[PDB]
Amino acid sequence: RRRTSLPAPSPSSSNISLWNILRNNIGKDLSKVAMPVELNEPLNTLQRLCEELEYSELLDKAAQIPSPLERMVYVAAFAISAYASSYYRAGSKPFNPVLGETYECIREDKGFQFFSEQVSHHPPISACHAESRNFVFWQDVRWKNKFWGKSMEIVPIGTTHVTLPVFGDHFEWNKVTSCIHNILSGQRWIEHYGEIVIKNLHDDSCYCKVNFIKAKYWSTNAHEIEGTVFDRSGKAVHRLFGKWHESIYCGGGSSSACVWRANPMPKGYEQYYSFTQFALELNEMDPSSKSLLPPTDTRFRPDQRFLEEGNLEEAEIQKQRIEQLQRERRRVLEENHVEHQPRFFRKSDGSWVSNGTYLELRKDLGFSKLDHPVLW
Ligand SMILES: CCCCCCCC(=O)OC[C@H](COP(=O)(O)O[C@H]1[C@H](O)[C@@H](O)[C@H](OP(=O)(O)O)[C@@H](O)[C@H]1O)OC(=O)CCCCCCC
C-alpha cells in the first residue's frame, strides 16, 4: 500500500563540508549557519514532529485504562518512544522548514489526523497538532543547538502535551538534552541525557520522572533509562527500566513486564537514510490526496523532493532559490512594519496552539477556494 522504498538511494556520505562549517562556528548559533543540501535527509522538522507518533498505539491503549497510574506508565513509554527512531539516524540533519510551510499526515491507519506549520524562521520554530478519537497530541518546539570542538549539542525547548478522550487527562512533559558524538568523526552516535518530568495537570494522583543516563559508548549503561511513577505522597509505585532504543519494561521488583519495543527496521534500511518504515511514508504523495493538500505542504517543496530523487544539483538550486524568496518576502513584510501571522496556529501564552481551522477548511476540497503564500 504505502511505499517501502525511495526512487534513489542515499549517498555514501557527503559530510566533507561539515568539517569546516562546524570548526568555524564553535559556540555559534547553528540555525544561522547555512549548510549544503547534501547534508539533509528527505524529512524536515515538521515531519520529524510527526514521527513522534510512530508508537501512537500506546496512547490508544491508555485511552481505555481506568487506573491513572497505568495510564501514566503507558504515556511515559510513549514519551520515551519518541527517541527510538533517532538511534539509527545517529547524526542526521532535517530540512529547515520555510516560514509558513505546512505539513500534514492523514493516517486512517492509526486513526489520527496530524498537521503542522513552521510558525517562525528567525528563530526557527515548528508547531504541530494531531487529533484522534483516542487522544489529542500537540506541541511547540524550538532549538538552541551548538557545536563545541568535537561534539554537537541539541537543546530542545517547548513542552509536549497529550489529552485522552474519556478520562479528562492532560499530560505535559519536557524535552531532554541530546548530544551527537564524533560528528566530524569516529563512530558517530547520538546520546540522550537528562530528566523528563511528566505531570497530569488534571489528575493529582501521580507524577512520573524518567532519567536518561549518560555514559561511555562501550558501557552496559549506555541508552539506559531509570524512571519512577510516584503517588502524591512522593513514594515510588512502579519502576521503569530498559534502553530507549530497544525495549522498555515496567515493574522492577516482585514482577516485570515489557511495555514497549522498537519496531524492526526495514531490511536494508541503511541504503535509505536509515529511515524507519514510518519515516519512509511521511514524504510520499498519493494521487487522490494530492488534490486535498494545500500548496504550502512539504510534499510539494521542490528541493526536498529532488533530494529524495537523488538529484543533488537541482536540489541545491531549488534550495538557494527558496532562501532568496523567503528573504525577499520577510523583506516586504517588514518594510510595512507588519509582524507575520501564521495561518493555523495562534499564540497562546508563549506556545503556538491550533486555532481550529486546518481540518475544518480541508473539508470537501475547501483549500481550493482560498489561496496561500507561495513559498516556491
Ligand atoms: C539536528 C536537530 C534538528 C535541529 C535543526 C532545526 C533548526 C535548523 O534547521 O537550523 C538549520 C541549520 C543549518 O541551516 P539550513 O538547513 O542550511 O537552513 C538555512 C539556514 O537557516 C539559513 O540561515 C537561512 O537563511 P536566512 O536566515 O537568511 O533566512 C535559510 O532560510 C535556511 O534554508 O542546521 C543545524 O541546526 C545543524 C544540525 C546538524 C545536524 C547533525 C549533522 C550530522
Author numbering: 511 to 860, 862 to 887
Copy text from the publication.
Human ORP3 belongs to the oxysterol-binding protein (OSBP) family of lipid transfer proteins and is involved in lipid trafficking and cell signaling. ORP3 localizes to the ER-PM interfaces and is implicated in lipid transport and focal adhesion dynamics. The ORP3 ORD displays a helix grip β-barrel fold with a deep hydrophobic pocket which is conserved in the OSBP gene family. The ORP3 ORD has a central ligand-binding tunnel with a flexible lid covering the tunnel entrance.
The PI(4)P molecule was well ordered in the crystal structure with clear electron densities of the ligands. PI(4)P binds to the ORP3 ORD by inserting its two acyl chains into the hydrophobic tunnel. The phospho-inositol group of PI(4)P is recognized by the shallow basic pocket in the tunnel entrance. The conserved residues Lys829, Glu833, Arg836, and Arg837 from helix α8 make direct interaction with the phospho-inositol group. The 4-phosphate group makes hydrogen-bonds with the side-chains of the conserved His631 (β4-β5), His632 (β4- β5) and Arg837 (α8). The 1-phosphate group connecting the inositol ring and the glycerol moiety is hydrogen bonded to the conserved Lys603 (β2), Lys829 (α8) and the backbone amide atom of Met660 in the lid. The 5- and 6- hydroxyl groups of the inositol ring make direct hydrogen bonds with Gln836 (α8) and Glu833, respectively. The ORP3 ORD is unable to bind PI(4,5)P2 as the 5-phosphate group causes a steric clash with the side chains of the residues in the helix α8. The PI(4)P used in this structural study has the acyl chains of C8. Ligand modeling into the ORP3 ORD suggests that PI(4)P with various lengths of acyl chains up to C20 could be accommodated in the binding pocket.
